[PDB]
Design a protein around this ligand. Structure first.
Ligand code: MTX
Ligand code: MTX
Ligand code: UMP
Ligand code: UMP
Lengths: 289, 287
């Protein structure tokens, strides 16, 4: 009942006890409230699902993009990452009342808040160096100097910047914790697409915990995802029932070849997955409009 | 197990698996990270502990004080609630570099954030009417018009206001959710004194959920407390081991006589605890 079984058990529970709940978009969900998953990062483990192939290059390039404080979707499209193109399109910015916003300029989403909380937003190409509160740098410093501190919070939930964002954050608040020279991270995610998004999010914050651990001379401990509204979309049900038949294989290991002086200078070449052995191909379409 | 056993199990888990940890001040804790408790608010139930008498009048008056957006500790001292006196004292404010702050003025803590997020703070006696984002009012409106919304977040965690606060928030972020016309609340608490503060916090946010439910014509559902650093102070250990020998009695019920048009106009006279039968014993000292 550890590891990937955590995720599979969450899928069953939503399928068996979920509540029907039309939703934001034209399509329905089965939904529960408040479920939690815990993943061991010990022995270099990283919880990348084996019952479904995860787009690992996508996870890495998006996280490095967050860590840099970047908000331009075009930067991800250049590395053939398409996950933010929809929400940064002329149509979608216009539907959000952001008419004077250049295509691919998502506003002060995630990374911007991580590295520049409270800074005035101009455009995604502006220079934000030394502007706002650098929550991530502050946490890294606290992990070196005072690891027992109970206020190591990094949030993207800034009520004043929500109207400027293409989308309000999902993975909204992370807390860090140290015991026995092990770094743990809890993520509060207000809303989780359990089929498509959550497996991505688990890989994202697990990697972040690994990377942050290597920056401050600590071993990785646990990643804990706590969800608000965890839902499966009605379209994903039959696909997920198939995924549940698959026997999980051991989780891959993360190898880190080096850690740079500044966390924002990490590149995909500095680390890789060793032993990632996922199963066959199966799709899950995401719905909006 | 369900109910109060959620709390007693958490205490046991910290005593048996907790990590030793010298903390903020010259004392130790046993600590774990990320534990969760779920409490039913169905059939009018409110999870006020029966294995230890909870200072219910304190819970109610502090929450009504939060809901008003009040930050003056002296308003609570007038109702013989002393829980915020220490942190609003001359000495404590000075130790925090708040030399130009009048005794009892805690800064833009909790409620202020609930009702006035991002508003510029002056003093606790200033008029904040219509200033900053009223997160609580926005949530109440969303529960009437669009209960399926998944952004019903009320937060006290304002990175820019932390330096002006007497203390940074513990109970920092609540989310609300609706399913089968039942209102649920999840609380994220970054740090929890499991012995003294957590029982109080459980009563506080359970009451808020009951009150909010009656404002918008929904029934109460579940209250979920998710902790960051869940810790027992070494000084509380022996007392808590005794509390665990006590067989819990059924939780009391909350009776609400009426609901006013605006939630900040609730008064202690509008509701009461029916059937609260705690055990007699006591103890537990702060720090
Ligand atoms: C983390 N994330 C954000 C995300 C996830 N789920 C969502 N679900 C919904 N309903 N709505 C969203 N806006 C949403 N956003 C993701 C994750 C994966 C993909 C995705 O489309 N994955 C493709 C790869 C996309 C691509 O081709 O670049 C895949 O084949 O796995 C999109 C967004
Ligand atoms: C919820 N809360 C805030 C609280 C709780 N635990 C803390 N623990 C620590 N270490 N530090 C804090 N600032 C703290 N604050 C509480 C709860 C109860 C009492 C308390 O001691 N109760 C007494 C005093 C209340 C009074 O006399 O007015 C009682 O009579 O019930 C204090 C703070
Ligand atoms: O990293 C992300 C971003 C978005 N979503 C999904 C969760 C919801 O199903 C969907 C829509 O978000 P809201 O409706 O909650 O705004 O986005 C995720 O699961 N993960
Ligand atoms: O509602 C509250 C407020 C505070 N605390 C406790 C948690 C910690 O023991 C202490 C706050 O200290 P830090 O977590 O900020 O170090 O107060 C609670 O349990 N509940």
């Amino acid at each position: 009942m550890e590891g990937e079984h955590q995720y599979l058990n969450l899928v069953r529970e939503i399928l068996e006890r979920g509540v029907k709940k039309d939703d934001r978009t034209g399509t329905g969900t089965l939904s529960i409230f408040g479920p939690q998953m815990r993943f061991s990062l010990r022995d270099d483990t990283i919880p990348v699902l084996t019952t479904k192939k995860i787009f690992w290059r996508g996870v890495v390039e998006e996280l490095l993009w967050f860590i840099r404080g970047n908000t331009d979707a075009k930067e991800l499209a250049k590395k053939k990452i398409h996950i933010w193109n929809a929400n940064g399109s002329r149509e979608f910015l216009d539907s959000r009342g952001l008419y004077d916003r250049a295509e691919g300029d998502l506003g002060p989403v995630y990374g911007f808040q991580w590295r520049h909380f409270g800074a005035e937003y101009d455009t995604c190409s502006s220079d934000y160096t030394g502007k706002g509160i650098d929550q991530l740098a502050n946490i890294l410093k606290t992990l070196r100097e005072n690891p027992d501190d109970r206020r190591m919070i990094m949030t993207a939930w800034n009520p004043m910047d929500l109207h400027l964002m293409a989308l309000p954050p999902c993975h909204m608040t992370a807390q860090f914790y140290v015991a026995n020279g092990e770094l743990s991270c809890q993520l509060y995610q207000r809303s989780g697409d359990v089929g498509l998004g959550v497996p991505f999010n688990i890989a994202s914050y697990s990697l972040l915990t690994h990377l942050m651990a290597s920056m401050v001379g600590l071993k990785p401990g646990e990643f804990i995802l706590t969800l608000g509204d965890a839902h499966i979309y009605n379209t994903h049900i039959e696909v997920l029932k198939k995924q549940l038949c698959r026997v999980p294989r051991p989780f891959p290991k993360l190898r880190i070849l080096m850690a740079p002086e500044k966390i924002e200078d990490f590149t995909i070449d500095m680390f890789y997955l060793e032993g990632y052995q996922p199963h066959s191909g199966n799709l899950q379409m995401k719905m909006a409009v």
